[PDB]
Design a protein around this ligand. Structure first.
Ligand code: QD2
Length: 859
């Protein structure tokens, strides 16, 4: 089939890894995942191509609703009919549903075109002009992001009446073409020899190994004897662990750490004891070690792919039985765990359990209580499942068998509890499966909010075919926006050798279930290719020639045939709803930063004002910390809007796309507090006192009565950023990374340093809040009010921040690698305290930042 071979080269191109590389591994796990996932994904591709037209809209154009709408006023809208210049502007209510708007559009059409139309309002969908956005469903118009956004900017919604027939034309054009428990002996292994080893000649090499279940030690850590340093060290010694073979859990991992002493770590390596087919491993294995920066229980259970350089470690997994031993089936595990003894205790110990389970480290006598009252947990306190799972002796199969009996009979938990079970603290595969079962309830909007964390959990996975992968693939194929971001979250880390096989495999499976989207993602990947080359010309040229000259040699290069085709007509990788239509070459430029970031301007004739967008292409810098912080800010925005608090936040797009490569979304009509404070002459803001510049600037951008709105936009946005930077630890705040929109909105940029590494408020910010006045405690205290209100809202969702940041440890961020970094967040959200005790601390911290604010005023 010539059809398949072209698809095959395109997939290889898109994932920046040849599909021949996978078949060159000779690996059956890789081949079984490929075959099984292609099956699963083509079944999804088939389901989708036969979806209803409204159902196909829900896949392609999932609704962008306001946080308040999820789970009154007079409005003016302009409606057109697909394939016509003629448009109708009309009045509607913010309480009207799209069906009433479509009935208005058809009634106007009927009188204008002089026809008693057969055309039903139910037969249409409202597209947002020049955007991959639709308004459908029975929701009042204000509930839609585009409408609600339009009201705030004072713009007119621009819609196109799209008939069910053209939506089916879209679907059709986009279709895919045609026994262990009987082996009492302790755990032992023969450490044979090392290969391609590097260490100082003075030193004497030792191998240390431990048996783990995620983090927790199954038994005491055991080290080996000292060997003289050479390229090929030779041990041939037996390490006997304090654990019977029957007591080994399913998810047991044997972890190694090679370190030279007279003290320095050289390399580390891990392997699962049971294979993907649940059989206990025996024989000789070649552990291609990763460079060490004291075992690494978290690191990949897959060897270093660069088999040349890597310092290998030859081991012998000894034969435990003269027959192959597999891990007992769930039906076997449940038999052993069913027959248990129930905990009967007095009213006194009943108080102790309710006290401790609600109150998360414990004491060894209390762990014995929680285990004895484990039936009471399932019944009275199900959400305490995590505590109980932690007090389970995972190195003893009888206890583990008793736990899975309660787990398989456990009620489904809320999404907060399930997200907590995704952590590496709960490495059991049935616990992983239970957590996912309790997450199936996630809305596509919620899933999209936690997608980044779920992607990091993929790195904690021990085997390729897992329930999390199956889930994120099925949700991606059921939603084109989830599909888009899942693709990019994976594609961006393809340069990392530990994840390039897993991520490359997930992308291939996705591509098999979405042939059309692949071609849409290839077009994006082709634009990004050209931007790297164009950035490289800029980087070189900016050194030799002045900025106006480089700017024009870039503009010349952009005008080239291949660049014009490449950079035009594409879905924005920062937003699939945003179409990057016509590149405005003359308006493109670059920054005077070390990486010479490129500013790419775009416009749409069909979208009008909505099409005038820009992207920033940054190569040389790692954007993963900006994307986290912004996603965390966006969360706060959603959390606040849900309590009816709109703090006019600007959580702009930021997306890593490759190795120190990514895009950031341009927020137009905005300057830096720095550029404004320059206080340049002949400018409208030219201030007598520097404190005035910022307000003179707002006065200049918002004439007359509008300034009062611009001050409120600034006050609210200012309050939300004071909290965001406190709670999050956003340090290194200068005048050049605090920006202001012409609307009055304040926002922060350049989040390379968070979590410590209180609030930063100068008197010109206080001056704007105070409306120029010196003494204005009425206005200043509303700002403190908004700050406290916003902070109390976040604390209530403190655990959601805690659990998200926890799963984000897997991401390999240097400022987010251990529990000492989640510490800042527990301190800032004051979670081990009652709301008043927490408010008292916030008040003190606010006053302490306010006393630090009056240092500026002293002058
Ligand atoms: C620091 N420059 S960057 O890499 O382009 C970058 C940009 C942004 N955002 C994205 C949101 O929308 C924006 C709008 C404006 C700006 C900006 O820096 N304009 C200044 C204003 C004063 N002029 C004299 C020079 C240009 C930046 C952003 C964020 N992060 C970045 O890096 C980490």
């Amino acid at each position: 089939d010539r059809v398949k071979k072209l698809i095959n080269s395109q997939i290889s191109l898109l994932i920046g890894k040849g599909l021949h590389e996978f078949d060159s591994l000779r690996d059956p796990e890789v081949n079984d995942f490929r075959t099984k996932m292609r099956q699963f994904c083509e079944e999804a591709a088939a389901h989708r191509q036969q979806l209803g037209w409204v159902e196909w809209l829900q896949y392609s154009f999932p609704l962008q609703l306001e946080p308040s709408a999820r789970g009154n006023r007079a409005l003016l809208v302009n409606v057109k009919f697909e394939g016509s210049e003629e448009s109708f502007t009309f009045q509607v209510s913010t309480k009207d549903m799209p069906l009433a708007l479509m009935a208005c559009a058809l009634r106007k059409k009927a009188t204008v075109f002089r026809q008693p139309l057969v055309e039903q309002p139910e037969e249409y969908a409202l597209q947002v002009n020049g955007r991959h956005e639709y308004l459908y469903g029975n929701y009042p118009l204000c509930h839609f992001q585009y409408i609600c956004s339009c009201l705030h900017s004072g713009l007119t919604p621009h819609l196109t009446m799209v008939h069910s027939s053209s939506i089916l034309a879209m679907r059709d054009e986009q279709s895919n073409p045609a026994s262990l428990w009987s082996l009492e002996q302790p755990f032992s292994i023969e450490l044979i020899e090392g290969r391609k080893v590097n260490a100082d000649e003075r030193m004497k090499l030792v191998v240390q190994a431990g048996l783990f279940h995620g983090n927790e030690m199954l038994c005491k850590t055991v080290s080996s004897s000292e060997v003289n340093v050479c390229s090929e060290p030779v041990w041939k010694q037996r390490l006997e662990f304090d654990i019977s073979v029957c007591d080994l859990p399913r998810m047991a991992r044997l972890c190694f750490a090679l370190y030279a002493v007279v003290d320095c770590p050289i390399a580390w390596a891990n392997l699962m004891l049971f294979d993907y087919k649940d059989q206990l491993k025996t024989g000789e294995r070649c552990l291609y070690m990763w460079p060490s920066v004291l075992l690494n229980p978290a690191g990949t259970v897959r060897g270093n792919p660069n088999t040349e350089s890597a310092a290998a470690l030859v081991i012998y997994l000894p034969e435990v039985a003269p027959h192959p031993v597999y891990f007992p089936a769930l039906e076997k595990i449940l038999e052993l765990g069913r027959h248990g003894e129930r905990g009967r205790i007095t009213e006194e110990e009943q108080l102790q359990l309710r006290e401790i389970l609600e109150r998360g480290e414990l004491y060894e006598h209390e762990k014995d209580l929680v285990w004895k009252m484990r039936h009471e947990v399932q019944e009275h306190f199900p959400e305490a499942l995590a505590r109980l799972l932690l007090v389970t002796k995972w190195n003893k199969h009888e206890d583990v068998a008793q736990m899975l009996y309660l787990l398989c009979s456990w009620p489904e938990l809320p999404v907060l509890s399930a997200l907590e079970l995704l952590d590496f603290s709960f490495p059991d595969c049935y616990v992983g499966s239970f957590a996912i079962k309790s997450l199936r309830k996630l809305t596509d909007d919620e899933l999209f909010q936690y997608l980044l964390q779920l992607v990091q959990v993929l790195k904690y996975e021990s085997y390729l075919d897992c329930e999390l992968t199956k889930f994120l693939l099925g949700r991606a194929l059921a939603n084109r926006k989830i599909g888009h971001f899942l693709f990019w979250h994976l594609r961006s880390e393809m340069h990392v050798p530990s994840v390039a096989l897993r991520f490359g495999l997930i992308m291939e499976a996705y591509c098999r279930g979405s042939t059309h989207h692949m071609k849409v993602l290839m077009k994006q990947g082709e634009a990004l290719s050209k931007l790297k080359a164009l950035n490289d010309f800029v980087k070189v040229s900016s050194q030799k020639t002045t900025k106006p000259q480089t700017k024009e040699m870039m503009h010349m290069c952009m005008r080239q045939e291949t660049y014009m085709e490449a950079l035009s007509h594409l879905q924005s990788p920062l937003d699939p709803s945003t179409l990057l239509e016509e590149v405005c070459v003359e308006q493109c430029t670059f920054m005077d930063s070390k990486m010479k970031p490129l500013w790419i301007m775009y416009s749409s004739e069909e979208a009008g004002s909505a099409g005038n967008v820009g992207i920033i292409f940054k190569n040389g810098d790692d954007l993963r910390q900006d994307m986290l912080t912004l996603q965390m800010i966006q969360l706060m925005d959603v959390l606040w809007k849900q309590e009816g608090l709109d703090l006019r936040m600007t959580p702009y797009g930021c997306l890593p796309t490759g190795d120190r490569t990514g895009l950031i979304e341009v927020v137009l009509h905005s300057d830096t507090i720095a550029n404004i404070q320059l206080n340049k002459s002949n400018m409208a803001a030219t201030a007598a006192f520097n404190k005035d510049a910022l307000l003179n600037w707002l006065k200049s951008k918002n004439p007359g009565e509008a300034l009062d709105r611009a001050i409120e936009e600034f006050t609210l946005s200012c309050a939300g950023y004071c909290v965001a930077t406190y709670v999050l630890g956003i340090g290194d705040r200068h005048s050049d990374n605090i920006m202001i929109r012409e609307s009055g909105q304040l926002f922060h940029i350049d989040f390379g340093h968070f979590l410590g590494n209180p609030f930063i408020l100068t008197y010109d910010f206080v001056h704007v809040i105070q409306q120029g006045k010196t003494n204005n405690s009425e206005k200043f205290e509303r700002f403190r009010g908004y700050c406290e209100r916003a902070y109390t809202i976040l604390r209530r969702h403190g655990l959601l921040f805690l659990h998200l940041f926890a799963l984000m440890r897997a991401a390999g961020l240097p400022e987010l690698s251990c529990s000492k970094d989640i510490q800042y967040l527990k301190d800032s959200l004051a979670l081990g305290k009652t709301e008043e005790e927490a408010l008292k601390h916030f008040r003190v911290k606010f006053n302490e930042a306010l006393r630090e604010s009056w240092k500026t005023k002293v002058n």
